[PDB]
Amino acid sequence: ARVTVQDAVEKIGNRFDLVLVAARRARQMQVGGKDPLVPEENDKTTVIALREIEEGLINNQILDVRERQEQQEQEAAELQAVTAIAEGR
């Protein structure tokens, strides 16, 4: 999806929401939070995200869903720890 973006513009209609959704994805990867869901051709995270929009593995729904999942993945680890803030009682 380097030359034209048209194929991603179909998967999200706005053409604007694309830029924002693809960015929120690109930062998950550039700031090495995650690893790509599609073969990285030494393309930077700009296009690597855009490739994922075309192939249909990343959209606003998924990211909000994937985000909301980690919120509870990390909540579980701290569970036995943040509970030890019974010092307030």
Partner: protein, 1173 residues
């Protein structure tokens, strides 16, 4: 939950008056001395305009005296000198104050055009100014005596008035008096007074002036301000570093002009404090006061006095007001515009080897531009120990870095921008390709959009820094994403000149040449035949081709045929992608036919295939252009064999009309216009003579006898193809070059009989001079004129954004072909393409739904329409859209560089203006042609200017007649059958009337002739009528000039023209006020089923000219950008106006996300968080 305190990301902004106690809240010490710095140890003197105790340390985190120099000590106020040690930033943030002895009038609320201090007391200005310089005493709360509360007395009068009533009546003079009036004055009390007088005395002379005050008062009450505050007790001082005293080289100093001003104010104030303890005579303490009132005014806004000059320097010194104001408004937001990091420029050159999505960027430039990126990637991969090493590495230009730069360059767009940024295509995003050389290489197809030639023009580069900016520049600004003009859905990336001359020569045929008549298996072997010199490029040939047509249900059908073509056209088909027909390349391919080809490719295969196709077109056209060896020599410009004949004939025609003039058969002015025709004719004979000779006279033979065909002469191929030059310009090379005219316009009676292939002689050139010089002169000014028109249009649009998806209104405008007298000056298909239907369209027969309600009319629909005899269609337009505060996606249309419907958030107001304002360069600013037609004719339209001698229209239906007589104006009386008759308007009977005097006339008929004012058409004929008047009469000028601007744009401007309305009933609004139909439309809905019917209210749409419409803006920050700044703030500060941002202009000012495009998401998501919990 807890609110907040410290620096949040603010929204909304408030402006107001400053309480004297309020100014003290900001101050961190009173500046008490006119001292600056020491004269030896250039330290700041405590405590004066520059000071550490009050404002801040002279060097970072270091006490002034030097006791505490350790960076650990911060919150320390040194026991020596009261100097807290923090950043020097606070010498740019911290304010201070001066306490004034006597009150002093704030020159803005006293002298901004409508004096605020004036009409708040209902007191004249020349009287107030009289009180201030102690010319006369003025009463204050005159009590039960002899004197009005605001009456003014003279010295000799006040004394005599005093002898009678000692106390129980008081008068003062000077600033203290005004301050007393405002303090004592009760608005609430005076508000009740003004309410009775309105209803009691019924007068249009009286209650028109009365009402204008009462609303102005209760504004100031509900504001929050206190009238006393317009008289200054406390005066703030501007942080030192914003008016600095920095050193220069050679040891000489430089300083701001505010310093001379602020100094003089401090001195005169101090010298007055002294005079009060010396008990000086009134004649002096007055004079001192007068000087302070002057020095304050020269500080605030110098120029509303006598213009205080700077020390020893003739120039006047720049005041606070002069520091905000400018040309136009705030300098900072005006172009330019702020310099910007990560940028550069140089000369641009070509590079046909580019793909359309890239550009040639000098090695040297890319190194300096991406410097932080290289420092990063270098230490990321471990090639540098630390950033300081990376600095030295790229400084050393070690060869290792080049390989790094190519990494950081790859998927990282840059922005290219060329000189006058006219439409959004003036900035475009490319992928950078490293270049040895110091010039930028610019893909040739984009040259059209930039209006770039290569006579040495330079372009700028910009690096998208943030991740957002890369994806913004890649999905919106990239070259390949914007190939369609936003003005007219047609491709703007059409092949320019060299490249089209290429294809033309290629897909062209001659009568007999190598390869004549053979047959070949397919395109592949047609090239094989040519490259080896066996076949001629242009020879008539049957070849097997396989074309495709996706005519199935979205499915590709293949067709193979032995098509009758030429070798050239065969080879070319190897480019054309899939679903196009072989018919499209079977022709001759001129510039005209070559762009329609690109168009159909877009509307059938989509963006992606068109882009890569368009590249191949350029690459191939260039290649074969070189092979062709087309050139131009002297012998190419073939003169007609008959030229000298044609001259002597029209030369004898003047000799006929001459004989007749001398013999008085014809008159003198007659003879001039006679000769000018017989010359003007001969030029048309010489022109279409050579053009018959030049066009076809290559006469060549095929096996049999003789034959003739379109010429292959070099200079012809250029014009016929459309690569450059037209039979018009050619007419000056071979045939004679017209008659010229001096700047006057009065065309000279002895034409240029010579042409350019011949010499011109002395006189002929000298005559050619005038037209040439005025030509350059004109287009020099035509540069300024384009710029101003587009600027006004965005000021009145701008803030308009697509907001809703579908407002759900069934209303719209009726689209028909334009049919301007002759035949079909513009087709119906064009007017309706990309627009959405108001209501379902029926066949000529009915029960038959062709297009069902609102469907986006793309290319198929437009033909299924044109298949039947469909004659007119109603379409939703921006002028009709029920959505308030914006435009719903449906009512707009589709247009973009992309072919789908306009997206939510796209900022269509701006893009409308640009599209209209860009071609303004191609329109004439003269006048052309009783009727007019040119670029100022456009502005006159957008400005709603009523014309010189208007026509007048039937104000109501019914039978008319004349009454009374010739009193400068003869009364015309319309009388309807049912309704009231009362309309009698007095018409000047010395303009020719057209009304039949005893006939019934439909309201909105022509009662005289001549142009009519758009203000009428809206009022008498309807919102949809006036909107149709503008769009057709403006498009007439553009369409006369060959400029395509889809009505869509002109319509959005029209919307902003009738943003406002005036009321006619009552209940909850002001009966007569003018306001946006938006606020009404929402609020008659908020009364039709809400509170009371109240009543009401009915309104009336009002046509505002663009310049006047833009002048009214909700955001006061926006207004201070382009309006007069002094007035805007003053008018706004008394009102306590709150700006919520919301618009575009202001958010750019304050440097946050534009409330459109990508930001629309954020602003929308944040605006709802407001007015909530």
């Amino acid at each position: 939950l807890k609110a907040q305190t410290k620096t949040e990301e603010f929204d909304a902004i408030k402006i107001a008056l400053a309480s004297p106690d309020m100014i003290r809240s900001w101050s961190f010490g009173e500046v008490k001395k006119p001292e600056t710095i020491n004269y030896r140890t250039f330290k700041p003197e405590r405590d004066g305009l520059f000071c550490a105790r009050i404002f801040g340390p002279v060097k970072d985190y270091e006490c002034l005296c030097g006791k505490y120099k350790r960076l650990k000590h911060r919150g320390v106020i040194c026991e020596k000198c009261g100097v807290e040690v923090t950043q020097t930033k606070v010498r740019r943030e911290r304010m201070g104050h001066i306490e004034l002895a006597s009150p002093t009038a704030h020159i803005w609320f006293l002298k901004s055009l409508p004096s605020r201090i004036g009409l708040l007391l209902d007191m004249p200005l020349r009287d107030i100014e009289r009180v201030l310089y102690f010319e006369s005493y003025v009463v204050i709360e005159g009590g039960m005596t002899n004197l009005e509360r605001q009456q003014i007395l003279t010295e000799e009068q006040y004394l005599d008035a005093l002898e009678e009533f000692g106390d129980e009546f008081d008068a003062k003079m000077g600033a203290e008096a005004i301050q007393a009036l405002l303090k004592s004055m009760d608005l609430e009390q005076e508000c009740e007074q003004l309410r009775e007088e309105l209803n009691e005395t019924n007068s249009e002379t009286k209650r028109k002036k009365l009402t204008k005050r009462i609303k102005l008062l209760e504004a100031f009450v509900q504001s929050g301000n206190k009238p006393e505050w317009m008289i200054l007790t406390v005066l703030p001082v501007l942080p030192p570093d914003l008016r600095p005293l920095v050193p220069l080289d050679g040891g000489r100093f430089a300083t701001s002009d505010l310093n001379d001003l602020y100094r003089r104010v401090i001195n005169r104030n101090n010298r007055l404090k002294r005079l009060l303890d010396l008990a000086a005579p009134d004649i002096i303490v007055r004079n001192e006061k007068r000087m302070l009132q002057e020095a304050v005014d020269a500080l605030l806004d110098n120029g509303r006095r006598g213009r205080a000059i700077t020390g020893s320097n003739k120039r006047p010194l720049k005041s606070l007001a002069d520091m905000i104001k400018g040309k136009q408004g705030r300098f900072r937001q005006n172009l330019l515009g702020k310099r910007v990091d990560y940028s550069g420029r140089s000369v641009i050159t070509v590079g046909p080897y580019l793909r359309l999505h890239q550009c040639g960027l000098p090695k040297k430039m890319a190194l300096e531009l991406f410097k932080p990126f290289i420092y990063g990637k270098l230490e990321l991969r471990g090639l540098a120990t630390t950033i300081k090493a990376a600095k030295k590495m790229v400084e050393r230009e070690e060869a290792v870095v080049w390989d790094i730069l190519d990494e950081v360059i790859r998927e990282h767009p840059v922005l290219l921008n060329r000189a006058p940024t006219l439409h959004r295509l003036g900035i475009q995003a490319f992928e950078p390709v490293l270049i040895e050389g110091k010039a930028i290489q610019l893909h040739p197809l984009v040259c059209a959009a930039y209006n770039a030639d290569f006579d040495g023009d330079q372009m700028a580069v910009h690096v998208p820094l943030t991740l957002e900016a890369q994806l913004e520049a890649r999905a919106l600004m990239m070259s390949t994403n914007n190939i369609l003009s936003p003005a007219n859905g047609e491709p703007i990336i059409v092949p320019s000149q060299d490249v089209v001359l290429g294809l033309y020569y290629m897909t062209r045929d001659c009568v007999n040449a190598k390869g004549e008549g053979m047959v070949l298996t397919g395109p592949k072997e047609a090239e094989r035949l040519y490259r080896s010199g066996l076949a001629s490029l242009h020879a008539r040939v049957k070849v097997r081709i396989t074309e495709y047509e996706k005519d199935a249900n979205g499915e590709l059908v293949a067709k193979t045929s032995l098509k009758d073509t030429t070798v050239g056209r065969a080879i070319l088909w190897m480019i054309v992608p899939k679903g196009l027909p072989y018919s499209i390349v079977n022709q001759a391919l001129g510039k005209k036919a070559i762009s329609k080809m690109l168009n159909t490719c877009y509307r059938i295969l989509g963006l992606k295939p068109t882009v890569i196709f368009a590249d191949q077109i350029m690459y191939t056209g260039f290649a074969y252009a070189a092979r062709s060896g087309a050139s131009v020599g002297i012998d190419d410009m073939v003169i007609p064999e008959k030229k000298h004949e044609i001259i002597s004939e029209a030369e004898a025609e003047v000799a006929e009309i001459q004989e007749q003039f001398q013999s008085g058969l014809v008159t003198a002015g007659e003879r001039y216009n006679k000769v000018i025709d017989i010359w003007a004719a001969a030029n048309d004979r010489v022109s279409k003579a050579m053009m018959d000779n030049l066009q076809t006279e290559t006469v060549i033979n095929r096996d049999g006898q003789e034959e003739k065909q379109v010429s292959f002469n070099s200079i012809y191929m250029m014009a016929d193809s459309g690569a450059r030059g037209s039979a018009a310009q050619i007419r000056q090379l071979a045939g004679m070059r017209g008659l010229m005219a001096k700047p006057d316009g009065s065309i000279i009676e002895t034409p240029i009989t010579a042409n350019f292939r011949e010499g011109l002689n002395v006189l002929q050139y000298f005559i050619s001079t005038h037209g040439a010089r005025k030509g350059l002169a004109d287009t020099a000014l035509k540069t300024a004129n384009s710029g101003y028109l587009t600027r006004r249009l965005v000021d009145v649009a701008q803030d308009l954004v697509v907001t809703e998806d579908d407002c759900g209104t069934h209303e719209g405008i009726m689209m028909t072909p334009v049919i301007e007298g002759g035949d079909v000056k513009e087709p119906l298909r064009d007017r309706v393409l990309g627009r959405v239907t108001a209501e379902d369209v029926l066949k000529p027969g009915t029960a038959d739904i062709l297009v069902p309600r609102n469907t986006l009319l793309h290319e198929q629909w437009c033909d299924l329409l044109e298949e039947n005899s469909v004659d007119a269609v109603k379409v939703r337009s921006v002028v009709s859209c029920d959505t308030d505060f914006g435009v719903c996606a449906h009512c707009y249309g589709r247009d973009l560089a992309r072919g789908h419907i306009i997206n939510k958030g796209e900022a269509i107001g701006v893009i409308a203006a640009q599209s209209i304002g860009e071609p303004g360069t191609q329109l004439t600013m003269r006048t052309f042609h009783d009727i007019t037609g040119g670029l100022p004719r456009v502005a006159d339209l957008f400005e709603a200017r009523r014309p010189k001698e208007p026509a007048i229209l039937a104000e109501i239906s019914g039978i008319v007649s004349f009454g009374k007589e010739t009193k400068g104006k003869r009364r015309l009386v319309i009388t309807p059958v049912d309704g009231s008759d009362p309309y009698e308007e007095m018409i000047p009977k010395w303009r020719q009337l057209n009304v039949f005097e005893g006939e019934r006339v439909e309201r909105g008929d022509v009662i005289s002739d001549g142009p009519e004012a758009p203000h009428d058409i809206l009022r008498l004929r309807g919102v949809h009528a006036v909107t149709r008047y503008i769009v057709n009469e403006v498009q007439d000028v553009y369409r006369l000039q060959g400029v395509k601007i889809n009505d869509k744009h002109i319509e959005v401007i029209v919307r902003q023209m009738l943003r406002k309305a005036t009321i006619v009933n009552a209940g909850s609004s002001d009966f007569l006020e003018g306001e946006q139909v938006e606020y009404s439309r929402v609020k008659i809905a908020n009364r039709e089923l809400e509170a009371n019917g109240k009543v009401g209210a009915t309104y009336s749409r009002d046509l505002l000219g663009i310049t006047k419409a833009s002048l009214a803006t909700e955001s006061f920050i926006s207004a201070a950008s382009f309006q007069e700044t002094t007035r805007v703030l003053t008018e706004a500060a008394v009102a306590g106006k709150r700006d919520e941002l919301r618009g575009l202009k202001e958010n750019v000012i304050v440097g946050r996300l534009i409330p459109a495009g990508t930001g629309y998401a954020y602003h929308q998501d944040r605006m709802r968080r407001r007015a909530a919990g």
